[PDB]
Design a protein around this ligand. Structure first.
Ligand code: A1ANQ
Length: 168
């Protein structure tokens, strides 16, 4: 149904909210929820672990079957799979992990995957333990994505910092 509510409008197509992406998926029933994935789709921590646990491991079982037959994704790439009980589809997107020395330049390619979907509920790519500067990740999102993106950032201080920085 895509019933998003309580978001701050940053640009004509980018919205942000201080919220857990899992709770937003349950409330919104979006057509697409984005997972902040790794190349072998191992959903142990961060956003991926939170989405997988909310599907009672159904996401991991599906992802393991996909990987066994197709092999790993590339950094900056994506994969559409079932959204299970959270969404119609899950778009698994691999942002670069700069704490593991991956190229930050690939974050544009990661967000470019969103342009295949009219509307998406998504997290901030490459932020948290992936190590990118969260203000830079929001700028790449705004400059790259042309479709409607609703960003859920589950940290009040980080949310207030991104909004404040964007309004400068
Ligand atoms: C920047 C953070 C605010 C963001 N985290 C989140 N953002 C939005 N909804 C969230 N729910 C939870 C949650 C819910 N339950 N649990 C046990 C967790 C956890 N962990 C976490 C979460 C974040 C964390 C790690 C990341 C990425 C983004 N991006 C990447 O590319 C990979 O690494």
């Amino acid at each position: 149904v895509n019933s998003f509510s309580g978001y701050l409008k940053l640009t004509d197509n980018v919205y942000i909210k201080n919220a857990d992406i899992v709770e937003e998926a349950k409330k919104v029933k979006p057509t697409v929820v984005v997972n902040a994935a790794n190349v072998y789709l191992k959903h142990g921590g961060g956003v991926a672990g939170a989405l997988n646990k909310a599907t009672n491991n159904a996401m991991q079982v599906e992802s393991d079957d996909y990987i066994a037959t197709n092999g790993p994704l590339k950094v900056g790439g994506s994969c559409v799979l079932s959204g299970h009980n959270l969404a119609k589809h899950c778009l698994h997107v691999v942002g670069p992990n700069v704490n593991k020395g991956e190229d930050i330049q690939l974050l544009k390619s990661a967000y470019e995957n969103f342009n295949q979907h009219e509307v998406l509920l998504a997290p901030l790519l490459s932020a948290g333990i992936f190590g990118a500067d969260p203000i830079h990740s929001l700028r790449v999102c705004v400059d790259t994505v042309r479709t409607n993106v609703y960003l859920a950032v589950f940290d009040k201080n980080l949310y207030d910092k991104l909004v404040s920085s964007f309004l400068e």
